[PDB]
Symmetry: D2
Subunit: 311 residues, 4 copies
């Protein structure tokens, strides 16, 4: 325990929250109406310790889509059900250079955090059963990770993502061409499942619980239940540490030093190993595609509380 | 006229033909049954001068698919009907480096000789009318270029190419994503038209007449009719000179110095400006994807007859 | 403390040591005689806890050159004397893609762990004074980090490295061309200083103490003295975590999860934050350029003692 | 003969000259004082037919440095004295992609038209003799190519190029590292010889005669003497056609279709096979590094006189 008095730590979270709030830069994603809708002023931070202690400030109950924030989670599920060796016969274990190919030196997506990786990972989960069944499987899993808190679905986002993801289809066919999917995979059906997963909704509060589960070696801080295998958690964290922030991953690993994962909805799934889970959210993104207020908050948190991986 | 006595020149063609015949290396394309079918021993050479003088040796009447050999032709048609400026707002004018992106520094395919280029070019031809109509349009055009000689269609090849071109679909969606097609293009419909064009059949004899048309500033050596605009012909030749032989383009431009275009069927559309048209054919391809006997023949022809662009 | 009974932990180190010993693969660097000299059978492991507790097994007193192992150290010194902001105006903070340019998107070496980076970093240290003086400065520093244990110099290696580093000169001139050095830098003089630094000698024992200093927030476990600033230590560790193992950095960060740095001499500077410092050594390197026995040992250590950054 | 009445053709040259004269854009190279010196208003065009017929307009007698214009020439000399096979064991035969490596897929410079290529080519010429002797050898050669017209040397340029070519040194050491030079080459001595060659001076008039020699299968139009082997001339032309205009090579080959070679001094060595040699000169260069007035003139010449390789 680095937070001796949670109650006082909470007071610092609010101060940091207020500080980041003053950062108004960035543009709200608008490649689809469902994301343009959001007000740039929404800003919420939710903490959930390994204990089970909670704390929120800002718009922490407004539902938003996980988007790329779901990548770490579905990867954790795959490693959990199939183990490191199998999962990684299809996807890499490290950051790529940056233009921006699809496959690496072995015709495998560089890692589970980039789109091609997430797509392949999606094709490994619950093979055999139909999409509908696969979807409930993952939903059930996400609920355990969130200790049964809010986990919804945005059909509007799903539909917009599907009838607009031309690049995800390009990736889909390319991977199919390079034989990157398991024998007998319905490629188009996987892209569909992929769009659905990106459309799952959460709130800063429910997500913080999911982060805390990863922060707690796979045990839900608020139910005590074992959701993910130790193996799965460690893998997910390692990859979030190196590829969770898009093109900002390097800077983030160097300056913040914490496993995190951003999403185009403006969310940032943050994890402080053996301490707490967190979810920052604010629609305005920067050139890198990360939440402006979120990035700011993270830097402040590590400076103030010295949570950096190497202190 | 560099061939004072055609009759004697013909005797040299046969000698070269016989020489190349001894080259048995290479593997016959087999990504689809329609190409695997072919016997590695088929070998045919057909000449057609600017005059109209013909000459054949070897299997010059066995129908085979143009495949990539159609690229120069459909490009010539586009420039003919739309002019250099318009056509090139969508496709580049030079060789790429070699891994192997899809678009260039301006989000345009590097040139009409690579798949992404050919696909975009296909989307420019006869816009408005339906596929069936577009197809007849091109067929009519190919007939004029061949002075009405053999020009067929392989439905079997078309079907195999379609239900197997995963990479061409990847390219299709990527180009659609990057807005590379003209406003209101039915991308999937274009890929269909593209597969059809690759399935058009010809014989060394009919093709040599098409080459001769390009060799004759756009006039069919055997009908005297103007098929392509001077502008269109010159453009096509320039691009065949630099991007007609896949990864062998550089070596070919340096050692042979003649506008040419190979295809996976084993054909090599050759052009000796203001002299003659030619079509070499032999199913066995080398690592580069060019006909082994064809490449050999070309080198011998330029050494013997000093036809190199810079003699 | 994760090692409750050091005495028993020591017994496990020996078991791991013995296990790795059975790995005879790899080739001993031979681009210069000074490295070819070494026997592939040399193998030594030395531990030094944050306490000051020591333990060695194998050839832990045979002097060998730090080579690339010096990179983390001279970087730590620069950040210590100049701070993060200044140092990083000249060198990057993350892994590159892999062919293998010299500069990044901003005309700066990608990071201090690659040759171009180390060279620039070398040009920042103790500017003003002459080489001889600069060298003693660093030597004095290395001694404090090693609690005054063995720190020598191989003039033979230095001479061979100098009269043979054509690629380091290429890098030198390229950086000078791109204005990557501080105003008024004697480029050739820096390369000289660089070759000298690579020729500094240590033993598994003295090096383990240096690693322990980094493992101890900058305090020499055996003298209690503050050698490096907290800022400097954290930076060095972050970069060792992501770029310390050449092309194996990704795999290493994923499977081992510990700050490390290899060298062509066969050494591997290992660090277990807040626990211990370590130095593995065995001349036979693998294709990646890392010590075969060393890599093996590291994997075994993390599996056995669960020292991975995310357990 | 495409120019039936030279006298009238001359009248068109002057019209084109006057037209290009109105193009004032571009910046005069200034990386060294010797080039900054030049007035942006200097503009000269000199023709020299295969006959021996001359014609000049503009500043055709003001001496300027060949710079990269010497590349085609020293390559022609190497092929002449060593033949295609030998020369090309060290240098490639085609355009590279564009960032901008030094070697190709076989550790050889891409072609003789890029700096790394020119440097290697320089190391092949007159091996054995000392620099001074090598220099006279080439000078003697250049004189024969120019029918003994003006061929000087700028020691000022040489000195500035030498004490400033940090990138050429980077290239020098890199090539030495990759073993790209013939056994026993004094790398630094070659770079010296290289800087000297770039400093050779000519005038539009003397250069046009050199171009005409290449345009005349290796025979000096004004002395009738055989200066270069047919083999050498054809090779040089092929490479000028594809790599003579820096990053504009593709556009130039497509729109102009003529063997050319630009230089940072603002000169453009142009060749119309079997017709004439030409040298355009105007210090203001564009972003690509080619003479603005020169590029303009070339486009106009090919449109007007239909000299394009494929008309
Ligand atoms: N420029 C381009 N970037 N990515 C593309 C396909 C990745 C191959 S094209
Ligand atoms: N290695 C790869 N090559 N091409 C791909 C897409 C081109 C972008 S991935
Ligand atoms: N292939 C090559 N790799 N690196 C070189 C220089 C890096 C620029 S050439
Ligand atoms: N960005 C860079 N370009 N060229 C360099 C060396 C070529 C290798 S670094």
């Amino acid at each position: 325990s680095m937070i001796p008095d949670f109650m006082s730590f909470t007071s610092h979270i609010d101060e940091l929250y207020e500080s980041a709030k003053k950062q108004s830069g960035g543009k709200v994603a608008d490649y689809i109406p469902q994301l343009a809708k959001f007000s740039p002023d929404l800003w919420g931070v939710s903490v959930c310790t390994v204990d089970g202690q909670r704390h929120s400030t800002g718009d922490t109950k407004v539902p938003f889509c996980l988007q790329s924030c779901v990548k770490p989670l579905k990867y954790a599920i795959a490693v959990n059900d199939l183990g490191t060796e199998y999962v990684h016969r299809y996807v890499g274990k490290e950051p790529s250079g940056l233009n921006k190919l699809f496959l690496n030196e072995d015709d495998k997506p560089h890692n589970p955090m980039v789109n091609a990786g997430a797509i392949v990972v999606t094709s490994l989960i619950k093979q055999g059963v139909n999409n509908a069944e696969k979807f409930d499987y993952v939903m059930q899993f996400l609920n355990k990770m969130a200790g049964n808190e809010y986990v919804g679905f945005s059909n509007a986002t799903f539909q917009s993502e599907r009838e607009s993801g031309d690049r995800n289809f390009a990736i889909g066919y390319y991977l199919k061409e390079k034989k990157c999917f398991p024998e007998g995979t319905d490629m188009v059906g996987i892209l569909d499942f992929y769009f659905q997963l990106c459309s799952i909704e959460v709130t800063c509060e429910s997500a913080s619980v999911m982060a805390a589960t990863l922060a707690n070696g796979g045990f839900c801080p608020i139910t005590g239940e074992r959701v993910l295998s130790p193996e799965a958690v460690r893998n997910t964290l390692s990859l979030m540490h190196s590829c969770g922030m898009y093109d900002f991953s390097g800077q983030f690993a160097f300056h913040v030093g914490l496993p995190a994962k951003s999403g185009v909805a403006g969310g940032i799934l943050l994890v402080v190993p053996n301490v707490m889970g967190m979810m920052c959210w604010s629609p305005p993104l920067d050139k890198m595609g990360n939440s402006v207020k979120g990035i700011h908050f993270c830097h402040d948190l590590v400076s103030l509380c010295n949570f950096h991986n190497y202190d």
